[PDB]
Structures are given as C-alpha cells and as structure tokens.
Design a protein around this ligand. Structure first.
Ligand SMILES: O=C1N[C@H](C(=O)O)CC2=C1S[C@H]1[C@@H](O2)O[C@H](CO)[C@H](O)[C@@H]1O[C@@H]1O[C@H](CO)[C@H](O)[C@H](O)[C@H]1O
Ligand SMILES: [Cl-]
Length: 138
C-alpha cells in the first residue's frame, strides 16, 4: 500500500482533460477521507467524505484561501462503504472538477481558484488503504 497521507505532484498544475484516479479500500469503521488539490498553502478543491457527522454520512467540498475555509458544498449521495474497495476519478473540465466514484457520476465542483496551472499537488488522506494514485491526459 502507499503511505497515507500521500502527496501526488501534479506537474504544471491541472488543466482540462486531466483525469486523476485514486484506488483504495476504506478501513473498517472509517471516519473520513480527504482529497486536497492544493495551490501552495491554499486548497483549491477539498473533497471530504465524512462517515459519521451526527450519525449521517455526507461529502463536504470546499476551498481554503489564506487559511480560511469558504462556503461548503454538500452532497448526501454517499457511495463509499467502510471496508470496501473504491475508485475515485476526478476529471478536470473547463468550469469544474467532475467526480465519479465506482464509475458513477457523483458531483461537480465549480472552479473557485482560477489559476489551474498552479494547483500542483494532490494530498490524499484519511481512513483508507491506498492502492494507487495517478493521472493521465484524456
Ligand atoms: O474544527 C472546527 N473549527 C471551526 C471553528 O472553530 O470556528 C468550526 C467547525 C470545526 S469542525 C466542522 C464544523 O464546525 O462545521 C464546519 C462547517 O460549518 C466545518 O464542517 C468544520 O469542519 C471543517 O470543514 C472544512 C471544510 O469546510 C474541512 O473539512 C476541515 O478539515 C474541517 O475541520
Ligand atoms: Cl486563483
């Protein structure tokens, strides 16, 4: 397994048609997963499955600018399950990140950070066994 937290450099940032694929397995009794697409200290796109927020499962997405979190975007469709293997695909499109889990579209997140070519790292963290993390241009 890859060591979590894991840093995947994104050379020259992201760009439309870049597809990022994360494969792993959720731990038993997991609490959280997080993908952090970072522009230096800023987080352009935070994708944060929460397994037990007041006994509900929710995916929180947000952006962190100058150490301040913005307005969350929340999705109640929750495809992850403790103990089970998953695939996350993040396709960069002109206006948003488009996320599919296990080959099913999940959500889109509009670009708040405009300098896509400066979003040059992806941090992967949380309660997973991480199998692989990679990108390709489609
Ligand atoms: O510790 C905290 N200090 C804040 C204070 O002291 O003002 C208040 C606050 C928490 S926790 C939790 C919860 O209240 O509700 C908030 C929205 O109302 C957030 O959901 C927040 O969680 C944070 O959300 C971020 C994404 O927005 C990241 O995921 C981050 O990792 C995570 O810590
Ligand atoms: Cl920007």
């Amino acid at each position: 397994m890859l060591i979590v937290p894991y840093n995947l450099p994104l050379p020259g940032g992201v760009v439309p048609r870049m597809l990022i694929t994360i494969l792993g397995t959720v731990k038993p009794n997991a609490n959280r997963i997080a993908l952090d697409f970072q522009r230096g200290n800023d987080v352009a796109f935070h994708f944060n499955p929460r397994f037990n927020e007041n006994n509900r499962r929710v995916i929180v997405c947000n952006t962190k600018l100058d150490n301040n979190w913005g307005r969350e975007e929340r999705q109640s469709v929750f495809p992850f399950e403790s103990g089970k293997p998953f695939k996350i695909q993040v396709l960069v499109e002109p206006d948003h990140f488009k996320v599919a889990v296990n080959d099913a579209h999940l959500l889109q997140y509009n670009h708040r950070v405009k300098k896509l070519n400066e979003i040059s790292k992806l941090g992967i963290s949380g309660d997973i066994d991480l199998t692989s993390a990679s990108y390709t241009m489609i």
